[PDB]
Curated annotation (Swiss-Prot), chains A, B:
Tissue/organ expression: Expressed in intestinal crypt and villus epithelial cells.
Domain free text: Composed of a large N-terminal cytoplasmic domain (CD) followed by a juxtamembrane domain (JD) and a transmembrane domain (TMD).
Family affiliation: Belongs to the InsP3 receptor family.
Protein name per Swiss-Prot or TrEMBL: Inositol 1,4,5-trisphosphate-gated calcium channel ITPR3
Processing and modification events after translation: Phosphorylated by AKT1 on serine and/or threonine residues.
Disease: Charcot-Marie-Tooth disease, demyelinating, type 1J: An autosomal dominant demyelinating form of Charcot-Marie-Tooth disease, a disorder of the peripheral nervous system, characterized by progressive weakness and atrophy, initially of the peroneal muscles and later of the distal muscles of the arms. Charcot-Marie-Tooth disease is classified in two main groups on the basis of electrophysiologic properties and histopathology: primary peripheral demyelinating neuropathies (designated CMT1 when they are dominantly inherited) and primary peripheral axonal neuropathies (CMT2).
Source species: Homo sapiens
Domain of life: Eukaryota
Location(s) in or outside the cell: Endoplasmic reticulum membrane; Cytoplasmic vesicle, Secretory vesicle membrane
Subunit structure: Homotetramer. Homodimer. Interacts with TRPC1, TRPC3 and TRPC4. Interacts with TRPV4. Interacts with SIGMAR1. Interacts with PML and AKT1. Interacts with IRAG2 (via coiled-coil domain). Interacts with CABP1. Interacts with TMBIM4/LFG4. Interacts with CEMIP. Interacts with TESPA1. Interacts with TMEM203. Interacts with BOK; regulates ITPR3 expression. Interacts with BCL2L10. Interacts with CHGA and CHGB.
Function: Inositol 1,4,5-trisphosphate-gated calcium channel that, upon 1D-myo-inositol 1,4,5-trisphosphate binding, transports calcium from the endoplasmic reticulum lumen to cytoplasm, thus releasing the intracellular calcium and therefore participates in cellular calcium ion homeostasis.
Amino acid sequence: QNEIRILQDKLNSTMKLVSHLTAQLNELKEQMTEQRKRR
Amino acid sequence: QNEIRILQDKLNSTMKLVSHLTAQLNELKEQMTEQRKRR
């Protein structure tokens, strides 16, 4: 049961990592938009 | 006591996860605003 709780925490961490990846993609899109605006 | 410190670290991680969820919601709102602007 303690391992199951740890597994649930790991799943939450995986969800956070997925959100971080989405944030990184958004940052890349923002950087591309800034570059286009500068040009 | 060491477990209590680990629990405190886990609570900090949970707070970070909550902040990450808020950031994801903000990113979704930004994406919706960008879509509305494009339309």
